[PDB]
């Protein structure tokens, strides 16, 4: 019933994904 399988959520990586905007640390 849960979209996908028993594994770490997708968004979990979206927060660590490589960004192209370095500013305001």
From Swiss-Prot:
The gene is S. Binds to host ACE2. RBD also interacts with the N-linked glycan on 'Asn-90' of ACE2. Cleavage of S generates a polybasic C-terminal sequence on S1 that binds to host Neuropilin-1 (NRP1) and Neuropilin-2 (NRP2) receptors. Interacts with host integrin alpha-5/beta-1 (ITGA5:ITGB1) and with ACE2 in complex with integrin alpha-5/beta-1 (ITGA5:ITGB1). May interact via cytoplasmic c-terminus with M protein. May interact (via N-terminus) with host bilirubin and biliverdin, thereby preventing antibody binding to the SARS-CoV-2 spike NTD via an allosteric mechanism. Changing residue 12 to N: Reduced host ACE2-binding affinity in vitro. Changing residue 20 to Y: Increased binding affinity to human ACE2. This is Spike protein S1. The lineage of its organism: Viruses, Riboviria, Orthornavirae, Pisuviricota, Pisoniviricetes. Changing residue 20 to Y: In strain: Alpha/B.1.1.7, Beta/B.1.351, Gamma/P.1, Theta/P.3, Mu/B.1.621, 19B/501Y, Omicron/BA.1, Omicron/BA.2, Omicron/BA.2.12.1, Omicron/BA.2.75, Omicron/BA.4, Omicron/BA.5, Omicron/BQ.1.1, Omicron/XBB.1.5, Omicron/EG.5.1; May enhance affinity to human ACE2 receptor. Attaches the virion to the cell membrane by interacting with host receptor, initiating the infection. The major receptor is host ACE2. When S2/S2' has been cleaved, binding to the receptor triggers direct fusion at the cell membrane. When S2/S2' has not been cleaved, binding to the receptor results in internalization of the virus by endocytosis using host TFRC and GRM2 and leading to fusion of the virion membrane with the host endosomal membrane. Alternatively, may use NRP1/NRP2 and integrin as entry receptors. The chain holds residues 482 to 506 of 1273 of the full protein. Changing residue 9 to L: Increased resistance to neutralizing antibodies and human covalescent sera neutralization. Changing residue 5 to P: In strain: Omicron/XBB.1.5, Omicron/EG.5.1. Changing residue 3 to K: In strain: Beta/B.1.351, Eta/B.1.525, Theta/P.3, Iota/B.1.526, B.1.1.318, Gamma/P.1, Zeta/P.2 and Mu/B.1.621; May enhance affinity to human ACE2 receptor.
